[PDB]
């Protein structure tokens, strides 16, 4: 009746809505519910760690062929060899012990995770009753553990988050000491301050246990004040800690990248190059079209090799396939992308809280420095403008250097590779942080700076212009939803001004500066777009710049080289197809086409209703829903970012192929 339809597209409208992906929004969660959710998720984390340990079994000591290699366990196998729970052992006898140890640790993780999940469930339901004693614990005022909960934290459980930092630090000191004693007792590894063995890990676990305990005492008796995070800790403290964890995670990725290449880490990562890996989905022993089983020996349709019966997964060496740095790059890039995403999400959730306090006037009611700074509307403009100017300068300089390098490679306009930026290396005072310092590393540093500033532009726009901007201050407008996609074509268009869309743009902009890491950690010569290509002079880089290594290929030729192995395997090929499929579908929701989709969905609804009557019968009242531009942007950011980083994984997991033999000039 034209109104029954109207309260159908008045159901996805980007007003304030339920938004199923916000059921666990911190606004409706209290402190104890957060504790319980984190405990349950840590229990599930223990469950999946046990699953990974099970996937690490190769002999099943009770007697059976084991699991094939997989990235889920290959990314942690060096750690388990470091802890002595797994082995790089060539013999079944020492591998049965590793299987037994992994099975026992998986069972232990299952038990501990079940306990942790049950505790988190009881915290989630506000049910801290001890079934053995029948009493009930008080979340607001509890003794921590007992006598230990009285000598330190003399009763008086923390009532505020700034008052909870200290007991948390003491809890983390307990964690460090517990891990140290677990090392010392279960895993051997007595604490020796020899910073070249795993014993140093136990020693530094005890050192950090002492440090964290003292710091927790100090912050228990002298709580610090960020002030504002105490009130809306659901979003303020949560987002600040999220961006802090993002920076910590980027730092951890850098630590992993530096450490896993050191000689002290050789028996755990570099020794992966002496192994042979049988990965799921890799090229299997193929057979002809007329295989008739009857094992022991093939009769009709001889397979590729007489060995590896039927459809066995073919071996691949760890030296040609650089599994050492493949695993290193997987771990490092995982933690780097997670850190970048956590920084972006912390800025976004902080902008959410900050718009919430700008809407109710609490923004002017903040006393802490962290907002009294940006409550200026000019220091906001100055900061964003100087970030944009620095991003413009760095990005323009580095991109023009890259384009000139590519021109000199291809000899466009009759140029030559000696006209390129082969001389532009890091300073000798900066050459210590690179191996084989060249224009590639200079370009990497400047591309990292440019991409970080490019994403920082949108991060600053989230931080400052959550509710209003100098443009929207000059106009008679204000932002009051953090998720509204637009106000319309007025002023030529107002698309994507909310902090959610600014988050999406920050993610898309950081895609470049983050994939630049994938090129780098794979050694892919981002200093030019066509490297190693035999066009004019791209193979002369190794001689003109006196390179010591030989990186894979330039930015564009990186999709030709090392894709020879993505295509060579079925699993990586189907991942490539799925990633590209997911990625381009984001155009259906980022392109300014939502109303076209709504109109076409109305047409399809009328068609299906009519097609359900001309041929079928009965009412066809079902109608096609269209994702609104808020939902369209959310789904599009997910589709785009996942589509690109399901294939950055393919670049990372297809091999290293960054040989240390600089090829001679073409001459």
């Amino acid at each position: 009746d034209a109104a029954k339809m109207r309260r159908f597209l008045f159901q996805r409208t980007e007003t304030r809505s339920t938004k199923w992906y916000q059921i666990f929004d911190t606004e409706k969660l209290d402190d104890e519910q957060v504790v319980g959710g984190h405990l349950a998720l840590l229990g599930v984390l223990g469950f999946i760690m046990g699953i990974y340990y099970i996937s690490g079994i190769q002999v099943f000591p009770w007697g059976a062929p084991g699991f094939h290699d997989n990235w889920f366990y290959l990314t942690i196998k060096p750690r388990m060899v470091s802890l002595g729970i797994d082995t790089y052992s060539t013999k079944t006898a020492d591998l049965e012990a590793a299987g037994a140890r992994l099975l026992g640790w998986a069972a232990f993780h299952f038990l501990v995770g079940s306990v942790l999940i049950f505790g988190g469930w009881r915290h989630w339901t506000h049910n801290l009753t001890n079934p053995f004693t029948g009493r009930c614990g008080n979340f607001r005022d509890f003794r921590f553990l007992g006598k230990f909960g009285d000598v330190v934290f003399n009763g008086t459980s923390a009532k505020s988050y700034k008052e909870a930092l200290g007991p948390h630090a003491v809890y983390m000191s307990l964690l460090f000491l517990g891990w140290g004693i677990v090392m010392w007792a279960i895993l051997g590894f007595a604490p020796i301050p020899d910073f070249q063995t795993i014993n140093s890990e136990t020693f530094m676990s005890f050192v950090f246990a002492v440090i964290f305990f003292a710091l927790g005492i100090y912050w228990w008796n002298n709580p610090p004040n960020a002030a504002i995070h105490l009130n809306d800790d659901m979003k303020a403290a949560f987002s600040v800690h999220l961006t802090a964890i993002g920076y910590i995670n980027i730092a951890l990725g850098c630590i992993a990248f530096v450490a896993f290449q050191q000689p002290s880490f050789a028996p755990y990562y570099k020794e992966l190059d002496k192994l042979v890996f049988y990965l799921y989905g890799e090229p299997f022993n193929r057979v002809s079209f007329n295989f008739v089983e009857q094992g022991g020996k093939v009769i009709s349709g001889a397979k590729e090799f007489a060995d590896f019966p039927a459809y066995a997964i073919l071996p691949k060496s760890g030296e040609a396939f650089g599994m050492a740095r493949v695993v290193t790059n997987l771990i490092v890039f995982n933690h780097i992308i997670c850190g970048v995403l956590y920084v972006f999400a912390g800025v976004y959730h902080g902008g959410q809280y900050l718009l919430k306090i700008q809407l109710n006037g609490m923004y002017n009611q903040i006393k802490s420095i962290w907002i009294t700074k940006g409550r200026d509307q000019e220091v906001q403009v100055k900061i964003l403008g100087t970030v944009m100017a620095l991003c413009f300068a760095t990005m323009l300089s580095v991109y023009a250097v890259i384009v000139w390098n590519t021109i000199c490679e291809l000899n466009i306009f009759g140029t030559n590779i000696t006209m390129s930026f082969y001389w532009l290396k890091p300073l000798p005072i900066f050459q210590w942080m690179f191996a084989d310092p060249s224009i590639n590393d200079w370009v990497m540093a400047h591309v990292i700076t440019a991409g970080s500033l490019f994403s920082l532009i949108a991060l600053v726009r989230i931080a400052f212009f959550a509710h209003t901007s100098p443009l929207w201050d000059d106009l008679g407008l204000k932002k009051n939803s953090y998720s509204f996609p637009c106000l319309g074509p007025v002023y030529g268009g107002t698309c994507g001004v909310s902090i959610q869309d600014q988050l999406w743009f920050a993610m898309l902009w950081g895609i470049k500066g983050l994939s630049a890491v994938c090129w780098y950690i794979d050694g892919a010569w981002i200093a030019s777009m066509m490297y190693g290509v035999p066009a004019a002079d791209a193979k002369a880089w190794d001689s003109i710049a006196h390179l010591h290594h030989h990186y894979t290929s330039g930015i564009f030729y990186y999709f030709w080289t090392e894709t020879v192995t993505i295509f060579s395997s079925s699993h990586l090929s189907t991942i490539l197809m799925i990633g590209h499929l997911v990625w381009f579908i984001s155009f259906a929701v980022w392109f300014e086409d939502r109303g076209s989709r709504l109109e076409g969905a109305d047409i399809q609804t009328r068609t299906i209703r009519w097609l359900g009557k001309k041929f079928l019968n009965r009412d066809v009242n079902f109608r096609f829903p269209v994702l609104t531009i808020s939902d369209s942007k959310l789904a599009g950011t997910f589709l785009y970012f996942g589509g690109t980083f399901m294939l950055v994984f393919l670049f990372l997991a297809n091999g290293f192929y960054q040989t240390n033999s600089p090829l001679p000039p073409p001459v």
Partner: protein, 358 residues
């Protein structure tokens, strides 16, 4: 240690109704400032509208208490109605008992509150006026049968004192404010004028002589005095369409205070203009009075406030900011709310306004 536990709840009603359930409990690990300890007290305030024709409401108040092992009791019935905007009349009776002594009283008193100014410039400019100076004029006729020997002795001593001591009018204020009550008088901005006794007499009542005391006094405030600054706000007789009851008490031993209060009464939510209701501005006299006793010990506080809005209503500008919104009920805990709770326990009158609309 000396940690302060307290749970507050506000269950509001929507529309024109201003009613709201108020139930709170509090635990304090500090010695109360009572020279007689331990002290226990129970108070029950029940109100029902006698005749909604012209404002009769029957307010009943029973104060049961035990201080240092003596049993105290004070019941008082009162039919209170507003003759006009500024005048109120109360008719009723009551009883006070301490130990084995008990004397029943009946009274017919009228209270006239007058504001010093009624300027429209302030009223139209300040949307939420807190301080509002003025005076009330209490005209009280209280009657007490003189059947006890102690009652007759009190009456004779008072008559002799008024006959002889001419300074009785201002020396009664020393007796009439027991101990720190006199200091609290000035702390809260109150000041009592000298009483004027319009007559003392006795006559043969239903069973014996009765002491009839026609006396008058007036006290004025500088703005904190919530009896004066907000005269009609403290007595919502117009919006009392059903019985209202409040049960409160505390068990205050020598090493702690155990507060318990219930409540169901109108006037919890007042319109603040622009279709925006608010929790009624916090009375200043309780805060400034408790601040003299709430400043004697350093205390940590874990105070939690429930504000259950009606169906569809939403809080806009809660300050200190609420912690967790859950459907239609709100929570305050820690952070600025704990700081504000400590502020108002120690003596501050800082504003914690909860504006809300539908």
């Amino acid at each position: 240690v000396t940690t302060a536990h307290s749970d507050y709840e506000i269950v509001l009603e929507g529309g024109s109704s201003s009613w709201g359930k108020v139930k709170a409990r509090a635990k304090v690990n500090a010695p109360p400032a009572s020279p007689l300890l331990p002290a226990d007290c129970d108070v029950k305030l029940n109100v029902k509208p006698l005749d909604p024709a012209k404002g009769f409401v029957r307010i009943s108040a029973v104060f049961e208490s035990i201080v240092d092992s003596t049993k105290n009791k004070l019941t008082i019935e009162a039919d209170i109605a507003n003759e006009t905007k500024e005048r109120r009349i109360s008719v009723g009776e009551g009883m006070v008992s301490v130990g084995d002594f008990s004397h029943t009283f009946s009274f017919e008193g009228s209270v006239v509150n007058l504001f010093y100014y009624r300027s429209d410039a302030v009223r139209r400019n300040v949307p939420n006026p807190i301080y509002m100076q003025g005076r009330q004029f209490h005209d009280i006729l209280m009657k007490v049968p003189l059947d006890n020997n102690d009652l007759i002795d009190t009456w004779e001593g008072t008559v002799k004192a008024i006959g002889s001591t001419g300074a009785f009018n201002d020396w009664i204020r020393d007796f009439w404010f027991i101990g720190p009550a006199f200091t609290a008088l000035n702390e809260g901005g109150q000041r009592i004028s000298r009483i004027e006794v319009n007559g003392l007499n006795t006559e043969s009542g239903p069973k014996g002589p009765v002491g009839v005391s026609r006396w008058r006094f007036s006290h004025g405030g500088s703005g904190m005095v919530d009896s004066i600054s907000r005269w009609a706000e403290l007595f919502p007789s117009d919006k009392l369409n059903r019985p209202a009851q409040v049960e409160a008490g505390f068990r205050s031993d020598s090493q702690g205070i155990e507060v318990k209060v219930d409540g169901e009464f109108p006037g919890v939510s007042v319109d603040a203009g622009g279709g925006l209701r608010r929790i009624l501005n916090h009375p200043l006299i309780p805060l400034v009075h408790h601040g003299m006793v709430g400043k004697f010990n350093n205390f940590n506080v874990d105070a939690q406030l429930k504000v259950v809005l009606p169906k569809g209503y939403k809080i806009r500008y809660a300050a200190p900011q609420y912690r967790s919104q859950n459907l239609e009920e709100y929570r305050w805990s820690g952070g600025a709310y704990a700081r504000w709770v400590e502020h108002v326990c120690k003596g501050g009158v800082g504003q914690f306004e909860i504006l809300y609309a539908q």
